[PDB]
Design a protein around this nucleic acid. Structure first.
Length: 414
RNA sequence: AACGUACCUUGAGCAUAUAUGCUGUGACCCGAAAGAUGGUGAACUAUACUUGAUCAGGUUGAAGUCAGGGGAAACCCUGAUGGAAGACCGAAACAGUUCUGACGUGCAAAUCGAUUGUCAGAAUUGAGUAUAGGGGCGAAAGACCAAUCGAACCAUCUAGUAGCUGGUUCCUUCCGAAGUUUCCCUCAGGAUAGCUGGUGCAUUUUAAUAAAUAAUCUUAUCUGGUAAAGCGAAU
RNA sequence: GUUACGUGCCCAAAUUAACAACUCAUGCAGAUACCAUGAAAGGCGUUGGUUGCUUAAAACAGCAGGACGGUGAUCAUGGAAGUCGAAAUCCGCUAAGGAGUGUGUAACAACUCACCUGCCGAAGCAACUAGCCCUUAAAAUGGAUGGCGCUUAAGUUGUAU
RNA sequence: GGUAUGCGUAGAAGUGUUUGGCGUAAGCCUGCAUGGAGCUGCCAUUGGUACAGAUCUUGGUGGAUAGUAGCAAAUAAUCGAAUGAGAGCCUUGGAGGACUGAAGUGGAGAAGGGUUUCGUGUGAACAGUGGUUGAUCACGAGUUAGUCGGUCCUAAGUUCAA
RNA sequence: CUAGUCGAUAGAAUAAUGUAGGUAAGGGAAGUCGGCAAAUUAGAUCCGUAACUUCGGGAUAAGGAUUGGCUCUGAAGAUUG
RNA sequence: GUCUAAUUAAAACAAAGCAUUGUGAUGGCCCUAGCGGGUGUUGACACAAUGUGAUUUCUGCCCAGUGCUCUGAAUGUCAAAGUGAAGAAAUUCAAGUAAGCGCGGGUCAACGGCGGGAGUAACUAUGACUCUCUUAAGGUAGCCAAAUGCCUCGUCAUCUAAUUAGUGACGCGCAUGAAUGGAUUAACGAGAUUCCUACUGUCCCUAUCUACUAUCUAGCGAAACCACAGCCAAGGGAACGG
RNA sequence: AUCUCUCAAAUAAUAACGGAGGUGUCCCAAGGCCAGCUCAGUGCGGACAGAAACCACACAUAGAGCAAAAGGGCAAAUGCUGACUUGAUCUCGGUGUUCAGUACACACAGGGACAGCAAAAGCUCGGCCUAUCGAUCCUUUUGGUUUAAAGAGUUUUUAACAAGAGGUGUCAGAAAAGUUACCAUAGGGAUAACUGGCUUGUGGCGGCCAAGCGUUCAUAGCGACGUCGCUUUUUGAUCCUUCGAUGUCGGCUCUUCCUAUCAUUGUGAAGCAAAAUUCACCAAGCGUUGGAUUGUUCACCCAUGCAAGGGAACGUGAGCUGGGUUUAGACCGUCGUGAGACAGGUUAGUUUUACCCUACUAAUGACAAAACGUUGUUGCGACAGCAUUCCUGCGUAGUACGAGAGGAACCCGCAGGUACGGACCAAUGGCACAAUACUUGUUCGAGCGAACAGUGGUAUGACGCUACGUCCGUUGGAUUAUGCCUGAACGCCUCUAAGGUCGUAUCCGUGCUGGACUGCAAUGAUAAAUAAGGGGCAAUUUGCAUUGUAUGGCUUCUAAACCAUUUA
RNA sequence: AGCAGAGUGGCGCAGUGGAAGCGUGCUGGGCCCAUAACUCAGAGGUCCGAGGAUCGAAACCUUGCUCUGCUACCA
RNA sequence: CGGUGUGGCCCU
């Protein structure tokens, strides 16, 4: 009569949770797969934006399952991302109190749309950074500054990370400012990274050398937030019965009598969502590269794989809702990328040692549903729309007056 | 000459001032449920009376009457016409049920909002008039009698009593207890001795510039059945 | 100026120009009377003992030889013949071989013990008694020698100054 | 009541005090600053005599808040013009949206109110917000009868000639 | 419509919980003290009506069908015959 | 139809009906400090006082205890005045001696009552029976684990996937019962007690949307309450601290 | 009130609703006192003669009697018997134990008298001593032959003094029946129901020795007869705190901790073949349910489960609920004559305030402080939290194994699934752009609307938001339980005596979420104006002025060593 | 826990210190054509157990055993 | 004019 009498779950796993609105809007990488050699000598992570979910058809190559050699429709998430710019390289050393940051010099030519993370009122600004520090590539520079410090990366340093832009200007968004992110090189024999990084300043980096077909990846970013929701939903605690003046929808018993306190674990009224989140080992499906300028028009293999062969793009008709003009190159990953609309989402490499079968299975995909989401799928492409539907008293049928006036245009000159 | 005496055995009281108590009225202080003598109000409400007044539209067909039809008579038989009953569902009139929902420092010293019952009579009601504080009145609950009802309401005899609780106001110096026996319709209190404090007063070669005492051991002398024993004594 | 509790340190005073031994703890080893704990019963855990034996005619441990017949006389036939269990009952043999020690051996047997001697040659062994540790000994908020802590002690004991 | 040829508008009582001091202590003495008319010391007496308290009486005043609680029922107000020191109102008048629905938030009667009805004029409390108008004040007027009605008659009943 | 009112502190603002008005795919009392808040039913015509009855009921039993708008015919009267 | 107005609307109340009870006027019931009033503008088919409760259907036995009246045959009590005797007298007794209570009946639709013991049937079990005990007379006709049976979560079918319940029937019934009223009851309930039919966010389990609040801002602006007061553990304590 | 025996620790005194009891009487002899004469028993006896009578004789230290309870005394008595008599008398005052050294009462020694027995001396002022009992007011006798009646007689009455008696057993003395669930008050923890608290007969709870059982076999598992021990869930105990109020029983929601462990991980035991199951050590990490009646904890079902364990601040009413219970209505059965109780049954009933301060979820943040600025961006982790879970099938195979029957769902791999956990929305489910189409009622004269019915009702309905859908949820390092490793003091062995190792959902760490609220790291910018200033470079070149430190020139120092795994 | 108590012939009861009391059964005969009824006759008692006191106890006393009554709390 | 019940089952 005084001990629970039906033991049960609790709700809301107290590990994650002092559950506050995060200390960072960026994607804090939190860690990297440690220091491995004969491994991805190149980068550890990448900078991605979120722009919707687009419905992939495929099948797997399982052992004797119940869908084995039988085709399915599993959801995908587009974490679109343009290439980035590397402009500096930070070295590190080791204390018994932590991993102290020692040396980085930035490259001499920052991007103007990445010269904004340092200011805050840029319309008011006189645009005076980097004035002083960038002219350190104009002096003697090596006997005093750079090869001194590069030797300090050579002699002293062990863990080198490099810094990275996010070329936001190639996605038309209402944000219009960069996102500086650290990225760690992960080879061995540190001077090979110094030879790597000193040639990788002021150069672009696209996802091709960073990622490929059928890799695992981790979606470290912010979540969509909510705001101050309640007590009944904010950890999924049940309804008290109907009769409750003082609440159909609150949590009853907060402590016992003794001791004379209130713990932090009790179901409390506390801010919902907008935490930091990451779940790990999300599986890549498709990488593509579809802007322009290869021979002529390029947009192909995005709306298609080799069983539909119809080009248009991974764009919907009228684009992803609240997000959607995928101009750039992009990746295609799995069920629920985290974070709301238009986000900033970081993606570091995986950490487990996969003996699970359902990580390594290489398969193509079969069909990308290129429909809207602002409606429902009744067609596929607006190019295909004139196959079913014929004349339409609109631009389909208004253009016959634009034809007789074009016929009157030759009658105008003659 | 035996014994009782508040008795004289050469006198000591009064007159007041002071201080401490004990006692009698306001009896250190305020305090209670109630008892009394007088007047008081039916202006909600119990309630009869008088005289006024109002309470929509709707379904169910009571006697009585009405020919058609059967049959020997008694007459049985559908059809209507007829609008009666403390009859029904419902509205302003009223009531107040379940939600135990809305405020519970209200809209309020009892109301609002959903819901539910009667609704042509034991009905509903404006005015006039009766009924009175240990009684009026009560289709009966000790309901109601002016926000009070197992006795109101307002001034007194009323600073009514309390073994029962609260507070019982300036400083230092000196001294420093009780919680026990008895008695008592006492067992939460009082008297009673006990302890304490005060007031001096008589005096020691134990009081004034011992050969006399009162308290602890000795010395000596009586005093008890508890340990320890004791069952090869009683019981 | 100096004392009836106590000095590693918060704590004022010794980690004493005072030591002899004590006690190893794997989930509270213990720590200053009342006082805020621990019993019944063990220990090839240790350290002190009392009483028994036995050994230099060399013991223990340790590896060598024998181990039955008179007699299957006999008790026991689910076997008794040495042997589930035996009334009995000696001896012969011999340094040492017993109507017998034997694996829930039903017969004969097989068979090693006891025993004596080889072998090694200074201590060994039986119960007994009682210091600490040791098992005992299980509570709900997480925290108690009073905390920090200690271990040829700051510890449980007798004590010097 | 006796007393000190007692100080007192050339500042007497209390009130403050970072002036100074006496007692073991209660308490005084003292300097300055208010203040404006009366006061204390010795010794005899003495009364309704000193307060932290009484769920103490009365009168200010806190924190919470002096800006939190909450002013959430009755469909719901709106631009433009005034005027005004200043207008979401009310204060109007111009539009024009919706309510009250004739068992009304409409027009006039009873009991009770008692000058509220009306014009004129307005500053502050009054109208749990404002305020130029108000059921507040200021200041003026305002209710006409033979027929409307009290008046007569009597009803239950006041017990009301001796 | 007729009469009269905007009089209930205001411009703003999409948090909980509460305050009242709701719908929610499956099953449908398991829920909880309990079928209580809440849902279906609701008007009228046409049938169709069970046991028990004091033969007045129970009776709206239950159990059902039917029900717009628009275009028409059929019927129920009065005066002068 | 009525009531607890402000927590009890119902199983309390209220009937209609039915059997009683006093009274023929000098009256019965009754207010009355006293004089005169109410019942009563009246008169047993009227008044007064009751217990019940439509009706349908039957009113079980008992007058001991007290309540009660009596056309009540009454030496056993019994008061003053008044009458007798003694006594100088206050006083002492005598003869007396009415109503009451006791005494004699009548009565329960007046309160309230309405037992156990052994034995006993060609199995057992029983008890149709037989004996005895004792009372004012022994619970009768019907009901029932009833709204009322401690033992209780009774014993038995059924409703149920599985039911301390609700129905049925069974009677040793702690303490069932005939107007302190018994047993059936048709019509209605803001009545309780359970299983179907319909059913729906009651729930499995929350999903969301509109109405004004908070909230935030401009005016407005208080109240209870408060030793000063706020970081917990273990130990002490007046024994669950700040 | 009152009496004894102890309780009482050797004077006395004395406790509780401690133990054993007793008393409200009884006796003209059971009194007073002289006289004779000794019983309890038991032996041998004796017509009828035993347990039977009555006589006789011995032993008779009291083993009896003494009115009564129990103690004490008691031997030519204090008993048996006998004689004879009223001292169970009048009187005066003191003294004993009750204690205040009171009163009553009861005993005791006198002085005086009058006697009574005995020859005398003596003995006697009631029972052999510890009980065998009462104060005023009056009523009332007995009384001197007594005074008073207030002017004086006489006579009767009352009145008084003195001894008793009628009487007060709640025993120092009122005359005395009930209940209030309509109840109103002074108060009390001096005194309970509830919550805590020490205690544990009660019960859950283990230990030990083995009488036996277990076919044999005491000890696999068991363990009787008896032996001794912890917990606080109840069950009483007790009265320590709150009576000027601690809102007291259940379920719901909900954090938590707890081992005496149900089942899951790692073993070991067996009468452990296997399957199955039992024992026992370590182990709190997730798990321990959906329902019928009841108001429940338990109880008992039905079912899932390859499987359903106990417990904590009476957890919790400013979170509810109010079904019981513990007010006011109301019926019933008995018990009381009744108003009226019923740890028995029915039904009906207001369940209140938070804005205070910490506590806690989320919200922003300052002067200052500091190996220093105003302000960036990008970093590090001390630090605190810590969550994934267990089943299932198919292989493994009818294989091993087992005589077979049965059966390793063995190790692992594969597929899946449960619960929570973290999230998103493409599709599908929900809710509605109250946008739009059909639409009733009324006004807008008629034709558009959605004009208004506080959202008219209806159907579809995109953004979102959401669950019923979706995608996900992991790896390092020690080391208990344990097996072994080598090895002696203990010549042998031997898992320890020190030593190297195999190992768990446990615990620690990565892994994931907040971060000395404002700790920390490098790193960017560094001003108005460029007339004039501002700000650095400055630790400085340049004086005045101040602090600090070696204070008598030095109570300075110096920042360069003692392995480079590890040892009395 | 006081207390109302009771326990007697096979069974039922009556019995207040001098007795073993009544009735029904049970037992025998007569009566009967045979069984019942009828008639005569006989038989039937640690008086619940252990004690108390005494001239004697079923009764008087308390004490235990059996058994109702009868309401009360809560090692 | 007083009372008076009962007779195990089957035998040309």
């Amino acid at each position: 009569m005084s001990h629970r009498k039906f033991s049960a779950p609790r709700h809301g796993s107290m590990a994650f949770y002092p559950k506050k609105r995060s200390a960072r809007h960026r994607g804090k990488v939190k860690a990297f797969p440690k220091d491995d050699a004969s491994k991805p000598v190149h980068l550890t992570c990448f900078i991605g934006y979120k722009a919707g979910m687009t419905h992939i058809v495929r099948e797997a190559d399982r052992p004797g399952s119940k869908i084995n050699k039988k085709e399915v429709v599993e959801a995908v998430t587009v974490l679109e991302t343009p290439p980035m710019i590397v402009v500096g390289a930070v070295g590190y050393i080791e204390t018994p109190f932590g991993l102290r940051a020692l040396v980085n010099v930035w490259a001499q030519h920052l991007s103007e749309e990445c010269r904004r993370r340092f200011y805050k009122n840029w319309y008011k600004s006189k645009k005076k950074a980097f004035t002083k520090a960038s002219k350190k590539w104009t002096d003697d520079l090596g006997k005093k500054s750079i090869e001194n410090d590069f030797r300090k990366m050579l002699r002293y340093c062990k863990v080198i990370r490099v810094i990275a832009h996010s070329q936001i200007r190639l996605i038309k968004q209402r944000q219009k400012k960069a996102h500086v992110m650290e990225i760690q090189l992960n080879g061995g024999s540190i001077e090979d990274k110094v030879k790597w990084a000193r040639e990788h300043l002021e150069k672009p980096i696209q996802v091709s050398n960073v990622f490929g077909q059928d890799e695992m990846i981790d979606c470290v970013g912010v979540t969509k937030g909510k705001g101050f929701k309640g007590v009944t939903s904010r950890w999924h605690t049940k309804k008290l019965p109907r009769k409750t003046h003082k609440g159909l929808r609150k949590v009853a018993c907060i402590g016992a009598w003794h001791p004379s306190r209130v713990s932090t674990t009790v179901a409390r009224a506390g801010q919902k969502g907008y935490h930091h989140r990451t779940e790990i080992n999300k599986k890549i499906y498709r990488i593509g590269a579809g802007i322009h300028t290869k021979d002529g028009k390029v947009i192909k293999n995005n709306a298609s794989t080799e069983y539909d062969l119809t080009d248009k793009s991974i764009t919907p008709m009228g684009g992803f809702p609240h997000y959607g003009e995928v101009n750039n190159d992009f990746v295609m990953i799995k069920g629920c990328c985290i974070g709301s609309k238009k986000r900033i989402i970081t993606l570091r490499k995986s950490l487990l040692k996969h003996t699970k079968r359902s990580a390594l299975e290489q398969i193509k995909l079969k069909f990308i549903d290129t429909s809207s989401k602002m409606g429902h799928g009744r067609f596929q492409t607006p190019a295909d729309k004139l196959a079913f539907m014929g004349p339409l008293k609109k631009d389909r049928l208004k253009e016959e007056a634009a034809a007789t006036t074009a016929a009157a245009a030759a009658a105008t000159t003659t």
